[PDB]
Amino acid sequence: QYYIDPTTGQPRKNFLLQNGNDWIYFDKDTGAGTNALKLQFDKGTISADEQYRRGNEAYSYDDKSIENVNGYLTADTWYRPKQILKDGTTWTDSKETDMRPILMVWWPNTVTQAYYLNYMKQYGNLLPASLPSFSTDADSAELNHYSELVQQNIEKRISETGSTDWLRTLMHEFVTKNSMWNKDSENVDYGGLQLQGGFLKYVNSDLTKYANSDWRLMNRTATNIDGKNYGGAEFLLANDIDNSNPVVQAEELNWLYYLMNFGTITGNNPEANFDGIRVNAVDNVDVDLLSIARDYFNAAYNMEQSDASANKHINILEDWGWDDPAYVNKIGNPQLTMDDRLRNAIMDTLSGAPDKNQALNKLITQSLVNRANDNTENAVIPSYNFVRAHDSNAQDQIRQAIQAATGKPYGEFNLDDEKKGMEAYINDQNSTNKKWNLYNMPSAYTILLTNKDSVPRVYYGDLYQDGGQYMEHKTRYFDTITNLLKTRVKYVAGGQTMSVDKNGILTNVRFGKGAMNATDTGTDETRTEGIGVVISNNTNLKLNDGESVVLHMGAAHKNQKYRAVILTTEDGVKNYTNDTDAPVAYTDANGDLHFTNTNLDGQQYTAVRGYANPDVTGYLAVWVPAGAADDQDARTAPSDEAHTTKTAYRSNAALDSNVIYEGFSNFIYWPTTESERTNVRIAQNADLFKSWGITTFELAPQYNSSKDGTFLDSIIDNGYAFTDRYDLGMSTPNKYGSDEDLRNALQALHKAGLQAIADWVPDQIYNLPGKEAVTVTRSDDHGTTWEVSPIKNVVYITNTIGGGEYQKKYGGEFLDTLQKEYPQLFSQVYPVTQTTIDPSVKIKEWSAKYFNGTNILHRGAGYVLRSNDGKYYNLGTSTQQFLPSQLSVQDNEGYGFVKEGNNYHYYDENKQMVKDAFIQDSVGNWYYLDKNGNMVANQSPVEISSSGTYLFLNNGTSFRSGLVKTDAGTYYYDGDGRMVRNQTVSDGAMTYVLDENGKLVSE
């Protein structure tokens, strides 16, 4: 049972020997001999091709074997194959860390497969440099050959590097290049409020049931309560919060309570709580929110009782739509509407360039109040007004100045870029001709601060330079505007008149406290109160001789000395903070002040005419009575009389005694030292703000920025874009300081007697880290389906799960207290939902079920993998378990080597019988199927073309690299199974000389 050679002591291995009628084969490994006539085809044998197909099957359908989201696969999915073709030669069982790209073995179509090949060659160096680009009409057997080559080379590089880090990077660079897996398939569009280039709304589906909702009532603003009109746009930025969901409404009330009790809750400090709210982005959320805030303020503070109790919680709305005020009035003015009619009237008549400004009459009429003869109180809708804001006429223009100074694209910049752009912006601000800055700021502010029936709001960026550390550098307007502000406290009260004469000159008059009309003789205090204002927008203004401008100061101001507050000059303006050296004018017996093209009593700049300089383009002059005492205070304290009417705020002299300060810019820089922190510095200046007549300080939103860079808010970290609703400089400082600095700022403000406003931002949330498969439809900013988009009821990977430790710590936690203390809040039916808030479920973590949708994320229409027929692949979690065919376990009945009669056939991948071909098995042997499809296994010399002489043992294996000793001589078959003739050969140590018939001569 061994055949050794007795002379050389060597055994013969892989040797077939004839012993009479007996045939003995001595095997490869040990030379162990066995009856050659009894060798049988191993019926468990598989082909080399079959092993390749099986190695690439998924190890399993568990979460760890196949990277997924809710069971769905993505173009980025890596998986654990059953076997790894290690170093591109040896099939080896996979470990659980042997994850591989699904795109190494599967493609959505053969076009993509071909692009994959060209990309892996050109960018991965995974195929020979000089190989033709693969074509659209590329053969599928050619594509498959070279896909296997790529596999082999990938495993080769993985072996030299011991890593797939390079491969994660390369595959995602490749993915990113396909239209179906990038923004090209998302219909990028910036129309309306698609500030980030597009929206996807969340829709109910059986495929993604955990993200379904009974609510998602969209666009339901003050003009669209029932849902039958268009309303404002529901969609704005980032992840849009579904505020029509009763459970979400309860969570907004929870958060509102937190802000109003922030100092108690976070530091046991009753002096560190906010006093009011700014409702941010009102026209972008369910208007039910205005009613929920009202009801809570009514239960906690008794807002509607009297002016005294209401005015102790000044609240304002960011409500841009022109039909909003009537609505705000209808529901009790729980928060002040803005007067956008009036702000626009200022933009149109003062704030434009000399050749853009319109006649000044509109300042009198285009407003919630007609100011021709404003001589009553409690008769109009109460409002706040303003000239600029952190966004309005600041953020766009500043980004223009940044782009112009640096050359970078719009809205992209680093801190050096901001600074250079700020330099350019401030130079523009200080020119006569302005490109990025508003004109006539002195006049605009004079209108702002002398209007009756208005709570004016002063903007930080008009007192201090927008870019820089908090309060670092003053604007050119600081003296002018603060002069106006202290003058407002001291003199501005009572009735108002406005008219525009024949020369287009506006005269604006306040009578002082105790007089509503020009005919009222007023009280004691009236005498040295009131104000007279002359404005023109005509840089070329010239009055003709004799012509004049009359201010009708009134019957309380007959034969009286007035002195200048502000005069226009050639290069600017002159400010006078009191009576010293201020030019004078005298009223006549009628109380009329007269100006002409001539100076009064030889005093320079007391004549009326046009100027054009960095402050004034047109004309500004402001006059008050002389000889007011230095402590004169013209304000009116709110009455604690019971309200006859269901409202909170009333438009009167007490409300008119309030000034809001918007105390930030988007462009405040990050502090370089703790003393530079906005909120520390706010704490140091509360008396300064009080001196200006500021009664409420509007703080920036204090939520920690997402810092994700997906919008201006998360570039300069203003606080409008955040992940965690309850993290107010707590996890780490916000741009303005720690939560400690915040509390100290609030406590210091309260010490001065100032209120403080929390910016309430219930529209949206940014940068949630947890992925979620959601059925989405591409849509405009109202959620109207984008008709040309193929993204329609399509599963899509969203970033919708998370919210921070503070949302987790506090979400829903005060709902108990609220039920206990104010049960009345939980019984109110709100107008859009027509049911109550729902406190029975606490939100401690966000997921898609609580969102109306998201900006487009640039993952691509096809990112979530589906078969040709539209069926989604899935592990089995969210829908039917269905995996690609190359990952799936295949039925092998009829495939591979099948016995039929006394023959073995081989049926290929298409179940095709193979004829006249060699097939290699997974362990290295070759087999030949003859022209009839029949495995040869007869142990006889046979001629085969592709001619050579082959011999196949009874188990069908091609005999090869060995000797055959028959009674008629010995033959040698080479490494390819072909008989050798007529040469000397060497196989290892053995040398074999063969003649022309193949017979062995010597060895």
Ligand X SMILES: OC[C@H]1O[C@@](CO)(O[C@H]2O[C@H](CO)[C@@H](O)[C@H](O)[C@H]2O)[C@@H](O)[C@@H]1O
Give min distance, CB of 561 to ligand X, in A.
45
Name which of 211 and 994 has its Cβ closer to Ca ion. 211
Name which of 47 and 705 has its Cβ closer to ligand X. 705
Question: Is 261 flagged in the annotation as binding?
Answer: no
Give min distance, CB of 277 to Ca ion, in A.
17
Applying CB under 5 A, the span of 123-131, 234-242, 707-715, 797-805 interacting with Ca ion comes to 234-242
Name which of 589 and 788 has its Cβ closer to ligand X. 788
Of residues 192, 227, 753, 769, which one binds ligand X by CB under 6 A? 192
Q: Is 662 in the site for Ca ion (CB under 5 A)?
A: no
Under rule CB under 6 A, which residues in 762-801 are in contact with ligand X?
763, 780, 784, 786-788
Please, which residues have CB within 8 angstroms of residue 422's CB and are 6 or more apart in sequence? 398, 401, 402, 465, 466, 467, 468, 667
Give min distance, CB of 242 to Ca ion, in A.
8
Q: Which two tokens stand for residue 791?
A: 């993204």
Name which of 285 and 682 has its Cβ closer to Ca ion. 285
Name which of 3 and 320 has its Cβ closer to ligand X. 320
**Exposed (0-12), middle (13-18) or buried (19+): which is 673, by Cβ within 10 Å?**
exposed
Count CB atoms within 10 A of the CB of residue 258.
22
Name which of 221 and 536 has its Cβ closer to ligand X. 221
Residue 695 has, within 13 A of its CA and on its CB side, a CA count of 20
Name which of 25 and 274 has its Cβ closer to ligand X. 274
Give min distance, CB of 190 to ligand X, in A.
8
d(Cα 351, Cα 440) in Å, to the nearest integer? 6
Applying CB under 5 A, the span of 98-106, 283-291, 409-417, 453-461 interacting with Ca ion comes to 283-291
Query: Which partner from the list ligand X, Ca ion, none does 191 bind, CB cut-off 5 to 8 Å by kind?
Result: ligand X
Applying CB under 6 A, the span of 61-69, 188-196, 304-312, 974-982 interacting with ligand X comes to 188-196
Q: Is 285 in the site for Ca ion (CB under 5 A)?
A: yes
Determine if residue 99 is left, alpha or beta; phi over 0 gives left, psi from -120 to 50 gives alpha, anything else beta: beta
Of residues 720, 760, 904, 927, which one binds ligand X by CB under 6 A? 720
**Are 442 and 477 contacting, i.e. CB atoms less than 8 angstroms apart?**
yes
Give min distance, CB of 192 to ligand X, in A.
5
Applying CB under 5 A, the span of 281-289, 793-801, 892-900, 947-955 interacting with Ca ion comes to 281-289
Amino acid making up residue 156 = K
* # of chain residues touching ligand X (CB under 6 A): 19
Query: Which partner from the list ligand X, Ca ion, none does 281 bind, CB cut-off 5 to 8 Å by kind?
Result: ligand X
Q: Which two tokens stand for residue 79?
A: 């998986």
Give min distance, CB of 284 to ligand X, in A.
6
Applying CB under 5 A, the span of 56-64, 232-240, 381-389, 400-408 interacting with Ca ion comes to 232-240
Q: Are strands 983-987 and 990-994 parallel, antiparallel or unpaired?
A: antiparallel
d(Cα 457, Cα 649) in Å, to the nearest integer? 16
Give the bridge partners for 58, in sequence order.
81
* # of chain residues touching Ca ion (CB under 5 A): 5
Q: Is 713 in the site for ligand X (CB under 6 A)?
A: yes
Q: Which two tokens stand for residue 305?
A: 């009782």
x/- track of binding to ligand X for residues 314-333 (CB under 6 A):
----x---------------
Name which of 391 and 417 has its Cβ closer to ligand X. 391
Name which of 194 and 539 has its Cβ closer to ligand X. 194
d(Cα 826, Cα 834) in Å, to the nearest integer? 13
String of b and e for 378-402 (b: at least 16 CB within 10 Å)? eebbbbbbbbbbbebbbbebbbbbb
Question: Is 234 flagged in the annotation as binding?
Answer: yes
Phi, psi of 697 (to 5 degrees): -100, 115
**Exposed (0-12), middle (13-18) or buried (19+): which is 488, by Cβ within 10 Å?**
buried
Query: Which partner from the list ligand X, Ca ion, none does 285 bind, CB cut-off 5 to 8 Å by kind?
Result: Ca ion
d(Cα 595, Cα 564) in Å, to the nearest integer? 13
Query: Which partner from the list Ca ion, ligand X, none does 192 bind, CB cut-off 5 to 8 Å by kind?
Result: ligand X
Of residues 77, 112, 245, 284, which one binds Ca ion by CB under 5 A? 284
Name which of 255 and 611 has its Cβ closer to ligand X. 255
x/- track of binding to ligand X for residues 282-321 (CB under 6 A):
------------------------------------x---
**Are 444 and 620 contacting, i.e. CB atoms less than 8 angstroms apart?**
no
Residue 761 has, within 13 A of its CA and on its CB side, a CA count of 27
Query: Which partner from the list ligand X, Ca ion, none does 234 bind, CB cut-off 5 to 8 Å by kind?
Result: Ca ion
**Are 15 and 966 contacting, i.e. CB atoms less than 8 angstroms apart?**
no
Name which of 218 and 653 has its Cβ closer to Ca ion. 218
Name which of 231 and 530 has its Cβ closer to Ca ion. 231
Question: Is 529 flagged in the annotation as binding?
Answer: no
**Are 80 and 65 contacting, i.e. CB atoms less than 8 angstroms apart?**
yes
Query: Which partner from the list ligand X, Ca ion, none does 240 bind, CB cut-off 5 to 8 Å by kind?
Result: Ca ion
Name which of 391 and 547 has its Cβ closer to ligand X. 391
DSSP label of 172: H
Name which of 311 and 714 has its Cβ closer to ligand X. 714
Of residues 57, 155, 186, 234, which one binds Ca ion by CB under 5 A? 234
Query: Which partner from the list Ca ion, ligand X, none does 391 bind, CB cut-off 5 to 8 Å by kind?
Result: ligand X
String of b and e for 631-668 (b: at least 16 CB within 10 Å)? eebbbbebeeeebeeebbbbbbbbbbbbbbbbbbbbbb
Determine if residue 853 is left, alpha or beta; phi over 0 gives left, psi from -120 to 50 gives alpha, anything else beta: left
Question: Is 724 flagged in the annotation as binding?
Answer: no
Strands in 50-188 per DSSP E: 78-79, 83-86, 90-93, 100-101
Give min distance, CB of 339 to ligand X, in A.
16
**In 208-323, which ranges are continuous DSSP H helix?**
246-260, 262-267, 288-301, 307-310
Give min distance, CB of 477 to ligand X, in A.
22
Position with the least CB separation from ligand X: 191
Integer-rounded Cα Rg, in Å, for the chain is: 42
d(Cα 167, Cα 157) in Å, to the nearest integer? 9
Q: Which two tokens stand for residue 454?
A: 């208005």
Under rule CB under 5 A, which residues in 720-779 are in contact with Ca ion?
763
x/- track of binding to Ca ion for residues 237-276 (CB under 5 A):
---x------------------------------------
DSSP label of 862: T
Q: Is 391 in the site for ligand X (CB under 6 A)?
A: yes
Residue by residue, DSSP assigns 646-675 as S-S---STTGGG--EEE---TTBPPPSSGG
Give min distance, CB of 72 to Ca ion, in A.
27
**Helix, strand, coil percentages for the chain (3-state, nearest 5):** 25, 20, 55
Query: Which partner from the list Ca ion, ligand X, none does 280 bind, CB cut-off 5 to 8 Å by kind?
Result: ligand X
Q: Determine the 3-state secondary structure of 418 from DSSP.
A: helix
Query: Which partner from the list ligand X, Ca ion, none does 596 bind, CB cut-off 5 to 8 Å by kind?
Result: none
Count CB atoms within 10 A of the CB of residue 493.
27
Strands in 229-359 per DSSP E: 239-241, 276-279, 316-317, 337-338
Give min distance, CB of 238 to Ca ion, in A.
10
Binding site as annotated, residues: 234, 240, 284, 763
Binding site as annotated, residues for Ca(2+): 234, 240, 284, 763
What is the binding site for Ca ion (CB under 5 A)? Answer: 234, 240, 284-285, 763
What is the binding site for ligand X (CB under 6 A)? Answer: 191-192, 195, 236-237, 280-281, 318, 390-391, 713, 720, 761, 763, 780, 784, 786-788
